[PDB]
Amino acid sequence: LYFQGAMDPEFRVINLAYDDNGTGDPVVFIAGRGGAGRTWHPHQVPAFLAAGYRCITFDNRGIGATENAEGFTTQTMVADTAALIETLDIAPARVVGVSMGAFIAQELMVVAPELVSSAVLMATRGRLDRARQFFNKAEAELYDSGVQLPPTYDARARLLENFSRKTLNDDVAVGDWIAMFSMWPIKSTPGLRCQLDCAPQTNRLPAYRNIAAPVLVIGFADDVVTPPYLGREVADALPNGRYLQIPDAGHLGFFERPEAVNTAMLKFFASVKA
Amino acid sequence: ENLYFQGAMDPEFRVINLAYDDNGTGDPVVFIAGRGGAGRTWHPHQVPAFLAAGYRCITFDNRGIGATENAEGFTTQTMVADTAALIETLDIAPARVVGVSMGAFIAQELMVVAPELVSSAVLMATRGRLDRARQFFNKAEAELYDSGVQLPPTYDARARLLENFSRKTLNDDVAVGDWIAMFSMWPIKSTPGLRCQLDCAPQTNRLPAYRNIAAPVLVIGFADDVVTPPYLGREVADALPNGRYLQIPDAGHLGFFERPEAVNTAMLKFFASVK
């Protein structure tokens, strides 16, 4: 059903949809920017259920019912995630985050290590290098100037930024991904714009040196949005962090290479106590 | 110091002049820039190495660039004729040719209709057809221009960086800083010439036509190129009877600016041992 998220600087309460399937070890998935809880269902949830896990997915602040939410920060979203885990009384929970959701996971582990037993961080970073800082500032500038991209150009960008070269060279896969875009419309909302800022303002890597819990950081070879090498940095900082690269995976490697990413998550999760 | 030659007449029976450059006294080489490139783009890296190697370099402003940025409804065949006219006016047939991208497609089509004009060529970042992704990218680019919408400068620069450079380059804060700033000095102006240049591309599979080009050709693939991926260049080289394939690692679509020494060394090696 719904849980109550953190109160926002303007003293308003927020409810956030979540979905809870199966029984067993609890796993909380946090999606990236623009991802609803549904993002984990086509590829992750059925594998995690078959492996005996209980899967919690949910709709981040600024998505769906709260797509008009604004004036929020990383801390606000971390607090949200803490509320889910506490409300559901599942602490310590295994956590799976990707990109913005992986940042949240990280920053949650900094302030509330006891909410989290082990984590997989996909397509992540602890800081923005000069390219990613420029990209981030360019997306903000796009939204803020009101101009809407035409739909084919918008699908071109989505294709080029999120998929491996190997996918782009395969006319059949390309066709399918373009169709697949119609089914995942990404509305340009105040919530989407606000999630853009839920990203490293500073180098957060020192803080990660104190995270004790076991962590698998997954990097995607072909990712230009959150390049593998920033993933690696995060893993090095994590005392009990390990790193694994998926070959021929774009930024959306968890959809694109779901069998390889699931195998590696499950493997890692079975090697650590609940 | 202001050289122009007369190119193909357009369908309105107007004469078109196109600016060109010509330096050096050695073996002639004609460079054909890619979409949106002025001839001057060959100058920061290619020209000085060719001049120092004793070649004479010819560069020019393709139809739809600079003084003809407002020109439209021309085709590949029109530009192939411009290039033919250049080689003829200068009386350097048969010439060495270096093309990149749209320029490499031009060179390839030149070779098909007028093989006598070209002794050998280097074709960088090329293809003889559009696959599903590249076809879709092209449709999307046309849609963007045709809708009237103007991308904000930073967002456009983002796209340039993402379309053009290797991953090794994007991860290099200093290099990236230099490329972001280099876009100020080479802005890519949205013009009817640019929009028409978009269609000077392989409408069909052109690979069968290329099995008849006799001249020695080096095609250069750039490893990280998503605009024209390497495997499309390989295809060009396979179709060519005397074509050979080289691939530069860590090179985006703009490999020839990004790895000028690797690319130059390859082309000069090639040209030294051609007939």
Curated annotation (Swiss-Prot), chain A:
Superkingdom of the organism of origin: Bacteria
Binding residues for substrate: 33, 99-100, 132, 251
Secretion signal, residue range per the UniProt entry: none
Oxidoreductase found in the keyword field: yes
Keywords of this entry: Oxidoreductase, Peroxidase
GO molecular function, one term: bromide peroxidase activity
InterPro entries, per the entry: AB_hydrolase, AB_hydrolase_1, AB_hydrolase_fold, Epox_hydrolase-like
Active-site positions on this chain: 99, 223, 251
Subunit structure: Homodimer.
Similarity comment text for this entry: Belongs to the AB hydrolase superfamily.
PANTHER family to which the protein is assigned, alphabetical: AB HYDROLASE-1 DOMAIN-CONTAINING PROTEIN (PTHR43433:SF5), HYDROLASE, ALPHA/BETA FOLD FAMILY PROTEIN (PTHR43433)
The protein's name: Putative non-heme bromoperoxidase BpoC
The organism of origin for this protein: Mycobacterium tuberculosis (strain CDC 1551 / Oshkosh)
